[PDB]
Amino acid sequence: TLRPQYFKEYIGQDKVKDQLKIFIEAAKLRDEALDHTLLFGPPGLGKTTMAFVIANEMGVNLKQTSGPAIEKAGDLVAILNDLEPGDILFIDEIHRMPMAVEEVLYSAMEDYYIDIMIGAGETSRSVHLDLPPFTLVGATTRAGMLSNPLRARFGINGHMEYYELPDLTEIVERTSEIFEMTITPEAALELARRSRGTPRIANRLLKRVRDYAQIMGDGVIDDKIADQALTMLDVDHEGLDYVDQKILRTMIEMYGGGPVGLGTLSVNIAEERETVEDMYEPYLIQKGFIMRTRTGRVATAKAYEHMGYDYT
Template structure:
């Protein structure tokens, strides 16, 4: 007897959202906008591996969050015409989890581990032989019956992604043959990404509207796509459905994202640094307690862009606000010699 399958509206909505998110991701290096240096190098390495009919060397993608590391991993898999299995460092709780993932790979397959710096050390150590010689040694049984088993693996490619390359141990980092530093995007690159995403979302937008979103997106495609969706909503309700520069500016002002891309957390971070601590230096733990954000969140999500754009400096004594931060918040009168 056949069972009736009932799909709820929530399930359908989730599937549509997932499908939509996937459609925003480029599928090939040619479609991938930005990261020109990395793409140029990867194109050579991928072509060489295909000519030799070998698995691509292991790849480490590192840089701030939201720059397209996961997307790049998917693009590499597509270019290599390889199956890809995805996981994250925290999801690998014990060596057996890693063995199951590796065992599931076909020859030439790709294992993508996001947040690889958060993988347990015991699982990381198992990766050494897997990456270098394509085998793992596992212990079968317990007590007197325990014995090692040499478990061969097919040639595969490990792609690791991390926001903290410095947190990786040297033995693991050294086993990656291809190191790719993902950098913040230029405003023109983000404008093109916004225009492409708007086309996928069937959103009417002009070039100036796309640029207004791009310049407030902190150099990050993920943020650009998120802001585009909210500006689209604003345009449909408050405008005529067209994302223009004035509509984008009004929507983003409503979201409290300023013309430099700083959001409420960034502004609070700088304001606290200046008003409570005379611009610093002040320790990160102190700032974290003051603004109510976790230290990891500040280090991964807030500081990289503020450092990149010259709003703060890191010193041995703590964080310091620059003259640009005072001027941006219109607090120049509080500057001290």
């Protein structure tokens, strides 16, 4: 499998790995579970993979679920009963869980017990459950999304960042070693430069280029071959997606560069507001294609020269 299993295999995120190593080692001298950890940042950067590594280092099983998957208190109660001592519970998009369910975790995380009503009619009665020790791992896009009473109960916080070209190059070379394939260093660098700094995209592109090199080439990935393969896909010469081009083009042609609010833009491009906010705007801002102002977003001169317009 492609997913790393141990910290020695996990490339990048040095600042996070440095802290997690110290807290995991200390928690292993003492015979007790690790404090609840919260990971936040852009999607697709590898925070789920981090949860598996933690479980393998602690030597316990990992269970996985998501906020939207829990709708009533009976769901969360049934899940917690299925945990063994020291197990790790991973909850994705924890910010999207219902408020009536969130207030059930408060007692579970802080004191390991839950008060519940059971039975029906004359049998209806309250019960006091006593849970075994466990570690919760939460995932969310931003810290300001969660309520103050919940955020205060997490003991560890991790912020994850985009990968740099030297890191993605090694990840691409690693992946191209599990597949019995050959890639030249110049090709690996070119393929990485197109991957928007995100490891998930890099794995998807490498698969498609591998197919093209088998049917349309000599079975080896080279700069001349990779250039054509990526040109056949919609990936621009600097990684911009077709959805990215739609946004930039709309701002210049229909809005004249702005200012425009992301809310109004979303309905004009027919994209869900949460996707443009969480997936597309973050990269476009951190790379100078879009600028933010008090009134709204504005396209920079770099965008005009890229899309082929005149920065009048």
